[PDB]
Amino acid sequence: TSISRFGVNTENEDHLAKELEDLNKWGLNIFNVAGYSHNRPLTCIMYAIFQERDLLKTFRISSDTFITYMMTLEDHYHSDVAYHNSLHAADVAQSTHVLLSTPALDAVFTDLEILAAIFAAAIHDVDHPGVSNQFLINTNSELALMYNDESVLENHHLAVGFKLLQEEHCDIFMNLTKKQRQTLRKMVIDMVLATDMSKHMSLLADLKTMVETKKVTSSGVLLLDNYTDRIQVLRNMVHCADLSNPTKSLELYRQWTDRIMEEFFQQGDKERERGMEISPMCDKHTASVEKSQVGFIDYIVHPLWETWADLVQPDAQDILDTLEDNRNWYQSMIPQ
Numbered sequence: 001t002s003i004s005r006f007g008v009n010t011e012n013e014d015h016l017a018k019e020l021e022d023l024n025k026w027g028l029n030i031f032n033v034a035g036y037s038h039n040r041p042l043t044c045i046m047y048a049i050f051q052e053r054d055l056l057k058t059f060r061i062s063s064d065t066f067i068t069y070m071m072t073l074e075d076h077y078h079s080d081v082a083y084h085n086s087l088h089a090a091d092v093a094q095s096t097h098v099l100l101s102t103p104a105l106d107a108v109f110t111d112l113e114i115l116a117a118i119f120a121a122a123i124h125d126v127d128h129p130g131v132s133n134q135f136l137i138n139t140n141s142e143l144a145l146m147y148n149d150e151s152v153l154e155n156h157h158l159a160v161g162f163k164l165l166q167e168e169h170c171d172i173f174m175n176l177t178k179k180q181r182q183t184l185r186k187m188v189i190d191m192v193l194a195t196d197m198s199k200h201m202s203l204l205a206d207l208k209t210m211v212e213t214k215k216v217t218s219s220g221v222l223l224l225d226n227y228t229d230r231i232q233v234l235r236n237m238v239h240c241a242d243l244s245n246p247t248k249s250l251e252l253y254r255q256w257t258d259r260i261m262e263e264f265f266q267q268g269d270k271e272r273e274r275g276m277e278i279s280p281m282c283d284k285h286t287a288s289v290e291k292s293q294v295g296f297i298d299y300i301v302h303p304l305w306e307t308w309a310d311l312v313q314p315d316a317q318d319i320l321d322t323l324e325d326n327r328n329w330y331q332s333m334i335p336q
């Protein structure tokens, strides 16, 4: 009955259960969850999140339909891609789960909005080929042609996550009302489209203008009046979870950095063999891993998370302290 307890099959139930004590914490170790779940971290963590939040009961999803859909989704993440594989998706889903329960956001979101955000996080990189939108554009990929060069992969992650609902015994949304399905689909599209880094500067600028005029209860909880403000917060939340690696404990962050660099270098080798110019950050002969992380934190991660932390103050205090310390550590590790 480990299938009834967990998403999944494992003989080391005690160890998996110990890791999952941290389900609601930023300090969860998703590498260990993967080790104790026969490398099904996405199925295992999603089943745990849905049990924890009572989402199967709320939306009348049988455990069989949910497990079937998650196993199929996880199968459609490529295990030969070094970073954008189901461990990443599992991490983003679990990080989203933690951020939804930030105290400044208590009682703000409906159950449909919670369901939408965790599902968007789970599907947001499905069927990633391990090369960038600009690679696909530069090689005249059918995917780039079909979406007119715009949010190429992100459009494709949506198309695959939604198509898999149509597989036998996979429709996790079968018992939502018609209107609830229409609203969830729109929300999920908005959140997955907001993971395209080409949109980051405009997302952040909007988020800042939102912090400027936020309303807060005594208790310090945010009042988010309308739909438009709620989906703005949710698009940024999923984006923050996608950009969360450098805010994790250093031992986790180092493992994420090893993986994104291996995936970049494998792209650069494909470029080189094709007689193409090698994309920035993808030439293993010239990369400076530690310099590059400091830049990434200074120009992208830290401005995003300081703004997020302003919105949910003081909830993200420890996240910012960890981020700053990891920045200093990587800078200190620049060779010479």
Ligand SMILES: CN(C)C(=O)c1cccc(S(=O)(=O)N2CCC[C@H]2C(=O)O[C@@H](Cc2c(Cl)c[n+](O)cc2Cl)c2ccc(OC(F)F)c(OCC3CC3)c2)c1
Residues within 6 Å of the ligand: 131, 132, 133, 195, 196, 197, 198, 242, 243, 245, 246, 253, 256, 257, 258, 260, 264, 267, 279, 280, 281, 282, 292, 293, 296, 300
């Ligand atoms: C193959 N190429 C090189 C590309 O695709 C690429 C080329 C030009 C621009 C961009 S970019 O997306 O505008 N952009 C700018 C900064 C780095 C990167 C970024 O945010 O990347 C995320 C992952 C990511 C990607 Cl790839 C694509 N989208 O859409 C969204 C995301 Cl969320 C990430 C995560 C973790 C990282 O490290 C650690 F924390 F593990 C990490 O470190 C990167 C190394 C260089 C320091 C990077 C990507």
Ligand SMILES: [Mg+2]
Residues within 6 Å of the ligand: 124, 125, 195
């Ligand atoms: Mg992506």
Ligand SMILES: [Zn+2]
Residues within 6 Å of the ligand: 088, 092, 124, 125, 195, 242
């Ligand atoms: Zn991602």
